[PDB]
């Protein structure tokens, strides 16, 4: 017969009120004495669009990483997308120190000098160094004495990715460390077994915390692709930059091959599976979650994200079992919020701005949205903080043989100072 | 019900309209001199015009120093960055000092950038690959240009792709019938999840379901978004967010601080430069707390020096307790508050006074309706000598046990019983200090 | 497990009325100590007050360590308890502010929520579709129980979990949706078909009743440095075990605190605070007690127990002496409880305690003999004695230790005073502080 | 009514099935 | 431009010096000091001439007195494209480098290679674009019309500039820059079309330009070590660079530079607080100024007969006899009223203070008793009272009132002796308690 | 990154005491189905009077450890 | 192109000048056909030192040469 509900402040909430109250100033108790007796008017209801909900300010859209990119943008069958992320920053080198000083050429000695570092004199070379080559060979177990100088003139990346060897000499001095053992027993190997459960603790800790759902916490801020690097006249520069930045072993490392294209490859052009090239390399994220850093705004969160909405949703949890009739009352645009709240995560019966008649009619409907005689409405659920009661009473001229009062209010605001007055 | 720590009393510096403050407002009490040289600094700082500008927080321990900080950064608000700091934060094991402060000074200063994103999003109903002719030729891929269909609400699009878009595809790990997020700026995809049309009783991965995104595809959203200069710094010298092999070998590895050069701060600088001239950013300068000054030592302000003449460095604020203390580093130098006296011509010296009887009741009286205490008025005076006495922050300190003494003998009014058994049972330092001077055994 | 020197300690020893007994849950006197210790625990169990530093004092061999594990046992369950030494705070990959802020978000903890949906019953069929290189893995599963029987999707995780433990069908497994478990309950068919090659007897298990899939609600608690790991980079469950977590930047820790506090506000996480114990807090530089001095005034701040047994002192990094070793603003901060010397009584209540724990037998004058020696030099030489004294008497095939075996006991192993005056007295048998010795007998 | 099962693609890849009776292994 | 806020040395433009190198009174921002800009100018004479390599200078004096500000006039006086390096004294000490290849870095930095380039663009405005799909796609040809202010031409499109047009989508109305060598497209942004806005070029397509770059010498050796990318340039993790490559680099540019491709740009290194050095990086700066490609070096003190870092003695100026004999003096003297009125009045028109005469005149008075950065700090904070109290011109109880808020140094000093007790010593003793 | 650092150097990283806490709790669990056996060893240091005070520091807290 | 008998080097220049007009717009650099022989050989002298050996054969990190 007489209820007036109470609710918090929400940290965005907070955010936004904090933000205005620093931002526009012009004596804040002075503003809530403009709330009083009601530009300051315009400073007045945007502090009560911050009130109601943060989405009646902006939008809230999706949380990605500010993109610090240059690429090729739309000024507005198949229309095809082709990946053209550059950095904005451009480091210009003039053709002199690149045809100079990097590429061979005639009057350069990078070629002779690079080959008399690399091949001539290598201490791993068998045809100068067999003695070595034999020790090593011993030592390590290689069957090939072409591996060391095959090892010492890779690029380590390139050893990762190529590295995959079976054959070993068993009279060697390589060896099996007691890890390596263990290692080699925990290859594959199921539960229930003493020696694998002993050191299978991680998947453990991971399988107990529940944490393949935990959700992402941080995203960066600002992602960048490398510098861009800028020679004008040459277009050596662009394919070697191309080649650099795509390498096609080193992007087929990190990917994988489409299952139709690796049925196509073995069985129709009779391609080996060992001939394939190396793929699955990247590593494993930690959940579905963590595979990217852009974030969708989730229409749970748009609930929690606004106090009196959480609130009204845990009241309309409460009181499906019974019919009620909602007021949005003088503020615009919260009537597209909620609609968009109760046609997108919780369906109802709903009527909103003859027909009306057509409810009255109907007991099983929640009318829910209205603005700012109604007697087969059963309850009117309300704010009652506003500042003319003569609008109190034309809403409540409206007003089933029975009437529950809610009045809907937020703590630690102007409101408050409103329901006071 | 909420959390309360240290100063969580303060909402603000408590001044009015012509610059003056009132004596018990804005969770403050006294400091009357101090607090509104703080808001002529706060209105300094939101006129946004002087870069380098430095003041000293003063005086004794316990006296409002740290406070005062805390009520500029709430007096400024979010969107103005405040940097928090400790004098003995800036020794890092990875990278020299002087960096570690220059990165602060650009984490000062803020940013807010209005930026234009072209997203395809939809549902994936076909996804086709076609191969090359020369799958193993060693230059190229093993497949060519892969087609795929999206569906958004009341709108359907084939989409032909590269094979770096489809590579962040297949990473991201899409089937068909999944709701997708193709961000055509960097040629990031995060998959939002399987379509609801289909059903959704049967997976056994917890996946989320999502209904049809709105609107047509090929959208372009206006996103606002708040960034620093050193985010910029950071994101430029570790590329990631590309899809180059630099960038997805970036992510894998350890991140390290490392020494950005000036030539990079430059060209961001630059770049910021060309974003304000299209009228699509603002600069936002900031704060930046270096509590317990003393702990630097000569080359850190040696570093401030010249740290402090640049044009786009922020306001620094500082906080001191020593006297006439020699500076750490060196071995004769005496200088006041551990500050050296280069470093004081270009500082602003805000003096803070101690506190009286009075005051010290008040400070105790809010401290005990902020943890929500209930206390009487003899308890209240018996803590405010005790204040007076030994110590303002053992008397702060010594609400928590007289209320735990309180709910366990069932009352929560505050007796002066249970202020004496809190006098018993926990020292301060000056009876524990005559303790130590009065036994063997080194007590 | 192992028997420890503070093995005795079953809680704390406090009354409802927080009055400690003269000798409760392995206890025994430290009065006032104990009452105090008593509040501090309960001020952390309320849990709304934060940032509190508490520095226990006192005389070595009284009890300080013994008053905080005591404090870690009465903690109860799913409550964080970080007890770390002095020295642990200097490294060579973390700086010491760094490491105190790990230390730090280490004490302190929160309590998710989750809904996890699980699946029991037999399993009919099992296909599995693999590409050509094992990659790409995708199928469909067939469970079910004797009321109705569904077919799910398997996704790439769920099939590579099934490969592990080879599930043949017949097999009653329980899949736990979330957390991704399967356990195997046993087989139900037992299959006149059996392979030659499989090893496994896996026992007869009862067909599944009721429906297939229930609905339960489950807690688990993270620290906020696990979380800080976690988000910090791509493999962080990785460098949560190995240690390779080198100084996490402050927008990591920044997120964090708003994404916490945004997981509070849905009702989702709980965050509940903890108790940092510092061993030795003499052994921290000046930086450190700066550092603490104001990340003690954080939002997320533990309450910090703090153990000293030292005088004035000088305090490191420092030319000057200070009380506790610790300077007088870090010491404003911190409440200080005391702790006092032991009499005869309270000696011979404490070796009564750690015989009747350590599972040794001694008599009544063997016991009057290791009280006096306990009061003599030390109560932690007495505390040794007993298990060399427990040794020697099953040596000499005695149950009892009698009055000769703690004799000899004292006679063959050595305390401080005996081994200083032995010293003293053949100071040319040892090397001097100035490095000189005489080797040869004569 | 009721929705739709996702479509399932299985061209191109290798199946193991194993059933109550017998385990099978189509490769190619 | 670039970001620009009002910093401690913006209002100097450069040296006010005429043609015969006489200084101005008070010209381009700098007023006082006549000796020491003349000298500075004879020193900027000296860098523009370009035959002088490695010749150190040092400016002392009493800090406050300009020393900072006659090498930032010395900096805004040399132009564009002639190297200048600034750095402290405190940022050698790394962790990751030593302390001589710091230096050796910032030695490398200053010196510049003058490299002019000429080459095709192509920056009109585009008509339309029209590409025909194939049957299947094997081969895609297409036309493309662009148009100037003056011109209009039709082309023919191959496979790879179709390639280059698909990426980086351009329509009809847009202004791009086609690179024909290196198939690079920029977008310059769309025209005057009503349906970002830049005109449309002029006409002759296909235009020679000529673009002039300068490239230091310490990233020609992080580009010539093979194990260090640009990358290095940017992310500053360099990590020690050998010695054969940079003699590779210091002959490659000699050759350079007779043959007659390129042009040495000698420049400035700038040293602030180069008594923080320590005495094996002024042994290194001995022996580092001998050599050809050398910049000339400015270092700043104040310090007088201190002790050296690193020994135990003492040297005059905090530097070793050998550095001060290898270096010339410049001394500043210290400023009377007249000069430190005419610098709070530049001051304020810059950081556009409407100020009182008699305002002035007491803050003349109290930069006359207390240091000039006192009086310099005072404006804009006795401004912002000034507002305050919503007048927009400062009057003489603005800043009264900015003197009684904001302390200087001798008061705080003569507050903290008073009350020492307060506070806390060198012994860490402080009596927390107010009474008793 | 896991053949990366298999190939690289294996540098000695500080373990963390939450991996030795679940190694000990699966190595009691074991423990208690009696299939393993824990054997205590002596570990011998020599010229202790070399050790430094941080370092005894830690010996004390390890020695009251489990 | 360019080829050293030698190393084995190649680099490409660009296409030639007779072919520049197959289209109207192209990205290929059209280089001129050279002046010269195809073969030009000529004789040189390298000045190395020994640790320019020691570092070209100990790369903790391999691939110098490409
Ligand atoms: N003017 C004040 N009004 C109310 N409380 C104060 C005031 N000044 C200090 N305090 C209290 O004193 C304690 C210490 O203040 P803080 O500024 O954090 O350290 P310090 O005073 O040493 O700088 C805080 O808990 C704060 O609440
Ligand atoms: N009240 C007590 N209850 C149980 N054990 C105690 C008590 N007082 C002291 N002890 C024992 O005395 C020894 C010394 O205590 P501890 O705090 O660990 O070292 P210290 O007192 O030197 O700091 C411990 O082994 C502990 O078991
Ligand atoms: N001759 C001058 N002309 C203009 N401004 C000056 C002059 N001399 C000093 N200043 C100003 O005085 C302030 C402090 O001088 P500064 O150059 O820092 O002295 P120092 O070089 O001794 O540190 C600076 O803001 C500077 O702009």
Same mark, same amino acid.
């Given at each position: 017969?007489?209820?007036?509900?109470?609710?918090?402040?929400?940290?965005?909430?907070?955010?936004?009120?904090?933000?205005?109250?620093?931002?526009?100033?012009?004596?804040?108790?002075?503003?809530?004495?403009?709330?009083?007796?009601?530009?300051?008017?315009?400073?007045?209801?945007?502090?009560?669009?911050?009130?109601?909900?943060?989405?009646?300010?902006?939008?809230?859209?999706?949380?990605?990483?500010?993109?610090?990119?240059?690429?090729?943008?739309?000024?507005?069958?198949?229309?095809?997308?082709?990946?053209?992320?550059?950095?904005?920053?451009?480091?210009?080198?003039?053709?002199?120190?690149?045809?100079?000083?990097?590429?061979?050429?005639?009057?350069?000695?990078?070629?002779?000098?690079?080959?008399?570092?690399?091949?001539?004199?290598?201490?791993?070379?068998?045809?100068?160094?067999?003695?070595?080559?034999?020790?090593?060979?011993?030592?390590?177990?290689?069957?090939?004495?072409?591996?060391?100088?095959?090892?010492?003139?890779?690029?380590?990346?390139?050893?990762?990715?190529?590295?995959?060897?079976?054959?070993?000499?068993?009279?060697?001095?390589?060896?099996?460390?007691?890890?390596?053992?263990?290692?080699?027993?925990?290859?594959?190997?199921?539960?229930?077994?003493?020696?694998?459960?002993?050191?299978?603790?991680?998947?453990?800790?991971?399988?107990?915390?529940?944490?393949?759902?935990?959700?992402?916490?941080?995203?960066?801020?600002?992602?960048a692709p490398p510098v861009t690097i800028e020679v004008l006249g040459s277009s050596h520069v662009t394919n070697s930059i191309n080649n650099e930045l795509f390498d096609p072993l080193i992007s087929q490392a990190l990917s994988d091959?489409?299952?139709?294209?690796?049925?196509?490859?073995?069985?129709?052009?009779?391609?080996?599976?060992?001939?394939?090239?190396?793929?699955?390399?990247?590593?494993?994220?930690?959940?579905?979650?963590?595979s990217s850093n852009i974030s969708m705004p989730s229409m749970d969160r748009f609930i929690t994200e606004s106090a009196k909405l959480r609130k009204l949703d845990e009241l309309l949890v409460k009181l499906k079992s019974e019919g009620?009739?909602?007021?949005?009352?003088?503020?615009?645009?919260?009537?597209?919020?909620?609609?968009?709240?109760?046609?997108?995560?919780?369906?109802?019966?709903?009527?909103?701005?003859?027909?009306?008649?057509?409810?009255?009619?109907?007991?099983?409907?929640?009318?829910?949205?209205?603005?700012?005689?109604?007697?087969?409405?059963?309850?009117?659920?309300?704010?009652?903080?506003?500042?003319?009661?003569?609008?109190?009473?034309?809403?409540?001229?409206?007003?089933?043989?029975?009437?529950?009062?809610?009045?809907?209010?937020?703590?630690?605001?102007?409101?408050?100072?409103?329901?006071?007055? | 019900?909420?959390?309360?720590?240290?100063?969580?009393?303060?909402?603000?510096?408590?001044?009015?309209?012509?610059?003056?403050?009132?004596?018990?407002?804005?969770?403050? *009490?006294?400091?009357?001199?101090?607090?509104?040289?703080?808001?002529?600094?706060?209105?300094?700082i939101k006129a946004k015009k002087m870069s380098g500008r430095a003041i000293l927080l003063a005086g004794g321990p316990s006296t409002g120093k740290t406070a005062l900080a805390l009520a500029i950064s709430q007096e400024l608000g979010?969107?103005?960055?405040?940097?928090?700091?400790?004098?003995?934060?800036?020794?890092?094991?990875?990278?020299?000092?002087?960096?570690?402060?220059?990165?602060?000074?650009?984490?000062?200063?803020?940013?807010?950038?209005?930026?234009?994103?072209?997203?395809?999003?939809?549902?994936?109903?076909?996804?086709?690959?076609?191969?090359?002719?020369?799958?193993?030729?060693?230059?190229?891929?093993?497949?060519?240009?892969?087609?795929?269909? $999206?569906?958004?609400?009341?709108?359907?699009?084939?989409?032909?792709?590269?094979?770096?878009?489809?590579?962040?595809?297949?990473?991201?790990?899409?089937?068909?019938?999944?709701?997708?997020?193709?961000?055509?700026?960097?040629?990031?995809?995060?998959?939002?999840?399987?379509?609801?049309?289909?059903?959704?009783?049967?997976? $056994?991965?917890?996946?989320?379901?999502?209904?049809?995104?709105?609107?047509?595809?090929?959208?372009?959203?206006?996103?606002?978004?708040?960034?620093?200069?050193?985010?910029?710094?950071?994101?430029?010298?570790?590329?990631?967010?590309?899809?180059?092999?630099?960038?997805?070998?970036?992510? $894998?590895?350890?991140?390290?601080?490392?020494?950005?050069?000036?030539?990079?701060?430059?060209?961001?600088?630059?770049?910021?430069?060309?974003?304000?001239?299209?009228?699509?950013?603002?600069?936002?300068?900031?704060?930046?707390?270096?509590?317990?000054?003393?702990?630097?030592?000569?080359?850190?302000?040696?570093?401030?020096?010249?740290?402090?003449?640049?044009?786009?460095?922020?306001?620094? *604020? &500082?906080?001191?307790?020593?006297?006439?203390?020699?500076?750490?580093?060196?071995?004769?130098?005496?200088?006041?508050?551990?500050?050296?006296?280069?470093?004081?011509?270009?500082?602003?010296?805000?003096?803070?006074?101690?506190?009286?009887?009075?005051?010290?009741?008040?400070?105790?009286?809010?401290?005990?309706?902020?943890?929500?205490?209930?206390?009487?008025?003899?308890?209240?005076?018996?803590?405010?000598?005790?204040?007076?006495?030994?110590?303002?922050?053992?008397?702060?300190? &010594?609400?928590?046990?007289?209320?735990?003494?309180?709910?366990?003998?069932?009352?929560?009014?505050?007796?002066?019983?249970?202020?004496?058994?809190?006098?018993?049972?926990?020292?301060?330092?000056?009876?524990?200090?005559?303790?130590?001077?009065?036994?063997?055994?080194?007590? | 497990?192992?028997?420890?020197?503070?093995?005795?300690?079953?809680?704390?020893?406090?009354?409802?009325?927080?009055?400690?007994?003269?000798?409760?849950?392995?206890?025994?006197?430290?009065?006032?100590?104990?009452?105090?210790?008593?509040?501090?625990?309960?001020?952390?169990?309320?849990?709304?007050?934060?940032?509190?530093?508490?520095?226990?004092?006192?005389?070595?061999?009284?009890?300080?360590?013994?008053?905080?594990?005591?404090?870690?046992?009465?903690?109860?369950?799913?409550?964080?308890?970080?007890?770390?030494?002095?020295?642990?705070?200097?490294?060579?990959?973390?700086?010491?502010?760094?490491?105190?802020?790990?230390?730090?978000?280490?004490?302190?903890?929160?309590?998710?929520?989750?809904?996890?949906?699980?699946?029991?019953?037999?399993?009919?069929?099992?296909?599995?579709?693999?590409?050509?290189?094992?990659?790409?893995?995708?199928?469909?599963?067939?469970?079910?129980?004797?009321?109705?029987?569904?077919?799910?999707?398997?996704?790439?995780?769920?099939?590579?979990?099934?490969?592990?433990?080879?599930?043949?069908?017949?097999?009653?497994?329980?899949?736990?949706?979330?957390?991704?478990?399967?356990?195997?309950?046993?087989?139900?068919?037992?299959?006149?078909?059996?392979?030659?090659?499989?090893?496994?007897?896996?026992?007869?298990?009862?067909?599944?009743?009721?429906?297939?899939?229930?609905?339960?609600?489950?807690? @688990?608690?993270?620290?906020? @440095?696990?979380?800080?790991?976690?988000?910090?980079?791509?493999?962080?469950?990785?460098?949560?075990?190995?240690?390779?977590?080198?100084?996490?930047?402050?927008?990591?820790?920044?997120?964090?605190?708003?994404?916490?506090?945004?997981?509070?506000?849905?009702?989702?996480?709980?965050?509940?605070?903890?108790?940092?114990?510092?061993?030795?807090?003499?052994?921290?530089?000046?930086?450190?007690?700066?550092?603490?001095?104001?990340?003690?005034?954080?939002?997320?701040?533990?309450?910090?127990?703090?153990?000293?047994?030292?005088?004035?002192?000088?305090?490191?990094?420092?030319?000057?002496?200070?009380? @506790?070793?610790?300077?007088?603003?870090?010491?404003?901060?911190?409440?200080?409880?005391?702790?006092?010397?032991?009499?005869?009584?309270?000696?011979?209540?404490?070796?009564?305690?750690?015989?009747?724990?350590?599972?040794?037998?001694?008599?009544?004058?063997?016991?009057?003999?290791?009280?006096?020696?306990?009061?003599?030099?030390?109560?932690?030489?007495?505390?040794?004695?007993?298990?060399?004294?427990?040794?020697?008497?099953?040596?000499?095939?005695?149950?009892?230790?009698?009055?000769?075996?703690?004799?000899?006991?004292?006679?063959?192993?050595?305390?401080?005073?005996?081994?200083?005056?032995?010293?003293?007295?053949?100071?040319?048998?040892?090397?001097?502080?100035?490095?000189?010795?005489?080797?040869?007998?004569? | 009514?009721?929705?739709?099962?996702?479509?399932?693609?299985?061209?191109?890849?290798?199946?193991?099935?194993?059933?109550?009776?017998?385990?099978?292994?189509?490769?190619?």
């Amino acid at each position: 017969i007489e209820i007036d509900v109470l609710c918090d402040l929400t940290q965005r909430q907070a955010k936004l009120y904090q933000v205005l109250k620093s931002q526009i100033s012009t004596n804040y108790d002075a503003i809530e004495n403009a709330a009083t007796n009601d530009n300051l008017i315009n400073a007045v209801m945007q502090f009560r669009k911050v009130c109601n909900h943060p989405d009646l300010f902006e939008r809230a859209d999706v949380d990605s990483p500010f993109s610090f990119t240059t690429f090729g943008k739309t000024t507005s069958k198949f229309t095809d997308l082709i990946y053209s992320s550059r950095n904005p920053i451009k480091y210009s080198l003039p053709r002199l120190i690149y045809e100079d000083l990097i590429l061979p050429n005639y009057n350069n000695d990078v070629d002779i000098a690079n080959k008399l570092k690399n091949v001539k004199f290598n201490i791993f070379n068998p045809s100068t160094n067999y003695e070595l080559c034999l020790f090593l060979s011993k030592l390590t177990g290689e069957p090939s004495l072409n591996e060391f100088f095959r090892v010492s003139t890779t690029p380590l990346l390139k050893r990762v990715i190529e590295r995959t060897n079976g054959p070993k000499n068993t009279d060697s001095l390589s060896f099996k460390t007691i890890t390596q053992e263990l290692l080699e027993v925990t290859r594959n190997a199921p539960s229930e077994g003493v020696m694998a459960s002993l050191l299978n603790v991680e998947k453990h800790a991971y399988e107990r915390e529940y944490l393949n759902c935990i959700q992402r916490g941080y995203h960066p801020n600002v992602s960048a692709p490398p510098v861009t690097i800028e020679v004008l006249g040459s277009s050596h520069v662009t394919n070697s930059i191309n080649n650099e930045l795509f390498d096609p072993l080193i992007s087929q490392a990190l990917s994988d091959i489409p299952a139709i294209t690796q049925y196509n490859m073995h069985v129709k052009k009779g391609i080996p599976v060992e001939d394939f090239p190396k793929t699955g390399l990247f590593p494993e994220p930690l959940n579905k979650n963590f595979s990217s850093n852009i974030s969708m705004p989730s229409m749970d969160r748009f609930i929690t994200e606004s106090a009196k909405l959480r609130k009204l949703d845990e009241l309309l949890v409460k009181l499906k079992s019974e019919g009620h009739r909602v007021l949005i009352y003088f503020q615009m645009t919260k009537m597209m919020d909620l609609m968009e709240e109760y046609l997108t995560y919780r369906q109802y019966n709903h009527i909103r701005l003859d027909l009306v008649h057509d409810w009255q009619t109907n007991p099983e409907i929640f009318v829910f949205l209205l603005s700012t005689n109604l007697t087969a409405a059963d309850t009117v659920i309300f704010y009652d903080s506003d500042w003319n009661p003569t609008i109190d009473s034309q809403a409540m001229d409206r007003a089933t043989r029975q009437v529950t009062v809610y009045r809907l209010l937020v703590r630690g605001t102007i409101e408050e100072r409103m329901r006071d007055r | 019900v909420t959390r309360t720590a240290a100063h969580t009393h303060i909402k603000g510096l408590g001044l009015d309209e012509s610059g003056v403050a009132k004596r018990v407002e804005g969770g403050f *009490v006294g400091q009357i001199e101090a607090r509104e040289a703080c808001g002529v600094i706060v209105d300094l700082i939101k006129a946004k015009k002087m870069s380098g500008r430095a003041i000293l927080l003063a005086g004794g321990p316990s006296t409002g120093k740290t406070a005062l900080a805390l009520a500029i950064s709430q007096e400024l608000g979010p969107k103005v960055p405040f940097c928090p700091l400790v004098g003995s934060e800036l020794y890092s094991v990875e990278v020299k000092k002087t960096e570690t402060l220059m990165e602060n000074f650009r984490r000062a200063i803020g940013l807010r950038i209005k930026e234009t994103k072209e997203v395809y999003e939809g549902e994936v109903t076909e996804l086709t690959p076609e191969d090359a002719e020369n799958p193993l030729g060693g230059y190229g891929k093993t497949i060519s240009h892969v087609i795929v269909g $999206l569906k958004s609400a009341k709108g359907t699009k084939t989409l032909r792709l590269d094979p770096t878009i489809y590579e962040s595809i297949q990473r991201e790990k899409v089937s068909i019938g999944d709701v997708i997020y193709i961000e055509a700026n960097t040629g990031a995809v995060k998959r939002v999840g399987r379509s609801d049309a289909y059903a959704t009783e049967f997976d $056994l991965e917890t996946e989320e379901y999502v209904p049809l995104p709105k609107g047509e595809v090929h959208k372009k959203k206006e996103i606002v978004q708040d960034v620093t200069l050193h985010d910029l710094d950071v994101a430029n010298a570790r590329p990631q967010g590309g899809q180059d092999v630099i960038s997805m070998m970036g992510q $894998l590895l350890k991140p390290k601080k490392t020494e950005i050069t000036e030539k990079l701060r430059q060209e961001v600088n630059k770049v910021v430069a060309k974003y304000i001239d299209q009228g699509v950013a603002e600069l936002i300068p900031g704060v930046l707390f270096i509590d317990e000054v003393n702990m630097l030592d000569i080359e850190i302000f040696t570093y401030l020096n010249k740290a402090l003449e640049s044009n786009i460095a922020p306001v620094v *604020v &500082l906080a001191s307790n020593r006297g006439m203390t020699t500076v750490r580093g060196t071995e004769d130098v005496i200088s006041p508050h551990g500050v050296p006296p280069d470093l004081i011509d270009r500082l602003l010296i805000v003096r803070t006074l101690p506190y009286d009887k009075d005051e010290i009741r008040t400070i105790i009286e809010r401290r005990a309706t902020v943890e929500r205490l209930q206390v009487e008025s003899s308890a209240l005076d018996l803590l405010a000598t005790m204040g007076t006495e030994t110590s303002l922050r053992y008397a702060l300190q &010594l609400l928590a046990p007289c209320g735990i003494l309180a709910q366990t003998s069932n009352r929560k009014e505050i007796v002066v019983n249970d202020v004496n058994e809190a006098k018993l049972l926990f020292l301060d330092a000056k009876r524990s200090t005559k303790i130590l001077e009065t036994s063997a055994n080194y007590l | 497990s192992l028997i420890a020197a503070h093995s005795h300690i079953t809680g704390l020893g406090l009354d409802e009325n927080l009055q400690p007994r003269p000798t409760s849950e392995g206890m025994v006197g430290q009065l006032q100590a104990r009452r105090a210790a008593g509040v501090i625990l309960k001020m952390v169990q309320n849990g709304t007050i934060a940032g509190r530093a508490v520095l226990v004092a006192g005389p070595p061999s009284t009890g300080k360590t013994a008053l905080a594990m005591g404090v870690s046992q009465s903690l109860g369950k799913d409550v964080p308890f970080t007890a770390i030494a002095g020295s642990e705070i200097f490294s060579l990959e973390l700086s010491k502010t760094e490491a105190l802020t790990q230390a730090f978000r280490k004490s302190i903890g929160i309590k998710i929520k989750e809904e996890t949906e699980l699946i029991e019953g037999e399993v009919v069929e099992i296909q599995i579709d693999r590409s050509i290189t094992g990659g790409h893995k995708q199928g469909k599963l067939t469970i079910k129980t004797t009321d109705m029987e569904t077919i799910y999707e398997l996704g790439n995780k769920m099939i590579d979990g099934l490969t592990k433990e080879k599930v043949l069908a017949g097999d009653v497994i329980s899949i736990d949706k979330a957390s991704g478990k399967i356990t195997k309950l046993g087989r139900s068919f037992a299959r006149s078909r059996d392979y030659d090659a499989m090893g496994a007897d896996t026992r007869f298990v009862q067909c599944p009743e009721g429906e297939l899939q229930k609905r339960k609600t489950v807690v @688990h608690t993270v620290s906020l @440095h696990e979380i800080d790991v976690i988000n910090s980079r791509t493999q962080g469950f990785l460098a949560l075990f190995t240690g390779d977590t080198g100084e996490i930047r402050s927008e990591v820790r920044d997120q964090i605190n708003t994404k916490v506090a945004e997981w509070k506000e849905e009702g989702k996480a709980e965050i509940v605070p903890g108790v940092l114990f510092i061993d030795e807090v003499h052994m921290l530089d000046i930086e450190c007690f700066s550092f603490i001095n104001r990340a003690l005034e954080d939002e997320f701040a533990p309450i910090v127990m703090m153990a000293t047994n030292r005088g004035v002192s000088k305090t490191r990094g420092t030319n000057y002496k200070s009380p @506790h070793g610790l300077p007088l603003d870090l010491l404003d901060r911190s409440i200080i409880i005391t702790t006092k010397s032991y009499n005869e009584q309270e000696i011979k209540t404490i070796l009564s305690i750690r015989a009747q724990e350590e599972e040794v037998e001694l008599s009544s004058d063997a016991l009057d003999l290791l009280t006096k020696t306990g009061v003599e030099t030390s109560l932690r030489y007495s505390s040794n004695l007993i298990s060399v004294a427990q040794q020697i008497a099953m040596k000499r095939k005695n149950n009892t230790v009698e009055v000769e075996d703690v004799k000899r006991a004292y006679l063959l192993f050595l305390d401080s005073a005996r081994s200083v005056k032995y010293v003293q007295e053949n100071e040319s048998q040892y090397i001097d502080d100035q490095g000189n010795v005489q080797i040869s007998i004569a | 009514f009721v929705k739709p099962r996702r479509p399932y693609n299985s061209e191109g890849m290798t199946r193991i099935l194993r059933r109550y009776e017998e385990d099978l292994f189509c490769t190619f």
